[PDB]
Design a binder for this molecule. Sequence first.
Ligand SMILES: Cc1cc2cc(/N=C(/NC(=O)c3cccnc3)N[C@H]3CCCCN(CC(=O)N4CCCC4)C3=O)ccc2o1
Ligand SMILES: [Ca+2]
Ligand code: NA
Lengths: 238, 86
Amino acid sequence: IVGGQECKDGECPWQALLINEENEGFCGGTILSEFYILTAAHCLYQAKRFKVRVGDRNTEQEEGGEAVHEVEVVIKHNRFTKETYDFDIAVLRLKTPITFRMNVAPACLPERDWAESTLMTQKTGIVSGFGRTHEKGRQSTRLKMLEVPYVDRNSCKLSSSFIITQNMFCAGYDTKQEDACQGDSGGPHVTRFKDTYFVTGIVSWGEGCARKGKYGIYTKVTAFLKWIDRSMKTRGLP
Amino acid sequence: CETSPCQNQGKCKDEYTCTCLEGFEGKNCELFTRKLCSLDNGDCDQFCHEEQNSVVCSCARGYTLADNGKACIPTGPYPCGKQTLE
Ligand SMILES: Cc1cc2cc(/N=C(/NC(=O)c3cccnc3)N[C@H]3CCCCN(CC(=O)N4CCCC4)C3=O)ccc2o1
Ligand SMILES: [Ca+2]
Ligand code: NA
């Protein structure tokens, strides 16, 4: 995250971090329940093995209440398109359940029609992660969040060198130096409504970080609410 | 009350007071309480939708819809979408 602020205690409790075989974070995720994490499909191809850490605010310092969970089942959207990042969505089912506590809680999945009329029409949403704090810089060891304005679809398409599918949306700033960045991929974009945070996007891709005339591109969660529901109603091995 | 300052058949007392019929609010009963999702989210805490030209509210994971049909009641200390207090 370029700009924004560090998350305070309890502030970004649905953040998850995908950690590779070296224990390095390489992508984020969003906590949906005791057993399910939402992430980007493209992330799955960027570590041979990975696990999911929750409850971490500082990666260079174990601090109790952090926990690492193994992944039992990976559910990538079958229509993930490598060339365009269309359908950049996956769900992970965990081997053992998360126990919710300070800094560890799920974000709400909204109903689709309601989300389209009442969340996607708000001025802004909030993106979070441990990714780079500057395009040419390094991953944060501290979890950060950033308020990002929604950008209208026409503007989004016109800004982009690459196809913006109906499964994506733009958020961010034309020239203000604030954006998500590499390492934030897969993490939460949430939208507040009356004191409650609902999942509205998955950090997906961007041409650089906070470049003038470029926006962050997010997987549009509304297009996948039914798909997420099916993936989750599953509830353990038979 | 001589001018009938109370709208929609509200009842005027007396510098004056309006006692509104059900379905009306505002000082002068000039505001409808019934409304659709486009306005104040239908008075729902969370999800609003319309059935039969009528508002129905519902709640996300970790909540139950209160008997009043609008509020959402948490089912535990860590319901979805709330920053953690402790
Ligand atoms: C919301 C949000 C903003 C943002 C910025 C990010 N930043 C990068 N890249 C760099 O900033 C960079 C900078 C300099 C050199 N190399 C890389 N993402 C790059 C990473 C490198 C691969 C290119 N690629 C994919 C790509 O383009 N596709 C075109 C259509 C289909 C996919 C990125 O997505 C990464 C995630 C982000 O999520
Ligand atoms: Ca830590
Ligand atoms: Na920009």
